[PDB]
Design a binder for this molecule. Structure first.
Ligand SMILES: CCCCCCCCCCCCCCCCC[C@@H](O)O[C@H](CO[C@H](O)CCCCCCCCCCCCCCC)COP(=O)(O)OCC[N+](C)(C)C
Lengths: 70, 57
């Protein structure tokens, strides 16, 4: 009676544990991958991250400058 | 890095215009009217090549 009205079967806890373990393992793998990607992006500068501004080339004036040699 | 190429002193020989600034100013308007074509060719070459050595002729 106690088992029938207060508890469930073993398979429920078993499969809930499986799902929880899958989620946690995926999160750990993602954390490691994110750290490695951050290291590579900061070292190389070839990714979307750690982009530091340079002078906009639209500010340059392309006209004759009263002197032939610029 | 590299060697700067310079024309020989013979390339820089030409019969100089040996009149002073007042004589040039007195005839400046007629000189601009009559000698426009070579002057404009030279100035276009000077502003396009951006190199004195490319505009000697
Ligand atoms: C002959 C009898 C011998 C044995 C006597 C047994 C005595 C039983 C008292 C001990 C109770 C144990 C505590 C249980 C509370 C937690 C369990 C909880 O999960 O059960 C809930 C049920 O809650 C219970 O109703 C709690 C009972 C607590 C009340 C105790 C009774 C006496 C208290 C006195 C109250 C005040 C009296 C008035 C004074 C003026 C439903 O939750 P649920 O997630 O769905 O379960 C899923 C499993 N399913 C599928 C089977 C449903």
């Amino acid at each position: 009676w106690i088992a029938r009205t207060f508890y469930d079967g073993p398979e429920k806890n078993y499969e809930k544990t499986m799902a929880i373990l899958q989620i946690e393992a995926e999160k750990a793998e993602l954390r490691l991958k994110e750290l490695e990607v951050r290291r590579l992006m900061r070292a190389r500068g070839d990714g979307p991250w750690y982009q530091y501004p340079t002078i906009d080339k639209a500010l340059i004036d392309h006209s004759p400058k009263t002197t032939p040699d610029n | 890095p590299g060697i700067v190429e310079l024309p020989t002193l013979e390339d820089l020989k030409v019969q100089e215009v040996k009149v002073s600034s007042s004589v040039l100013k007195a005839a400046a308007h007629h000189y601009g009217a009559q000698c426009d074509k070579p002057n404009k060719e030279f100035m276009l070459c000077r502003w396009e090549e951006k190199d004195p050595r490319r505009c000697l002729e």
